[PDB]
Design a protein around this ligand. Sequence first.
Ligand SMILES: O=C(Nc1ccsc1C(=O)O)c1ccc2c(c1)OCO2
Length: 167
Amino acid sequence: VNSFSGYLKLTDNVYIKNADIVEEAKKVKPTVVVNAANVYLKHGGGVAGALNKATNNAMQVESDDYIATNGPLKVGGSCVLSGHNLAKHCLHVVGPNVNKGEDIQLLKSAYENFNQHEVLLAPLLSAGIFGADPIHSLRVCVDTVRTNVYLAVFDKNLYDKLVSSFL
Ligand SMILES: O=C(Nc1ccsc1C(=O)O)c1ccc2c(c1)OCO2
């Protein structure tokens, strides 16, 4: 039993809710919140910009030190950093950005990072400003993640379309 509330159950391990991931994280304080990161951990907009703003830019400060030490992530890769005031940890995961021409096949590799964590609060990878089809992202999530994932979908219209079209 966990404290996630109001989710629709899609499969044995995948759950979904129309919610602002920032507000969800502040309420639940999950062990892991997933960020929709880029390889430079520049958290300018989309989910990343919102999560970083909620940390009063502490996420960005920590991220800049991470990059200065380690260099950029790989597309499809991840790193674990602090969750600040939102979660114990933040798993920064880089899905492919279609608006940069990146290979959508890398979306499966990106979701594989979730399997290293027993329970996660997450957005749909490569959705929103990353330009992929969110219906496809949900399909890859369900077919790749085996750990318990709670998906937060900001847009109510999109949430309804994701539920109604789910096979
Ligand atoms: O980019 C966002 N979400 C996202 C990303 C890929 S899918 C997806 C979704 O919610 O379906 C996002 C979430 C919450 C926000 C925000 C942006 O700005 C203020 O609060």
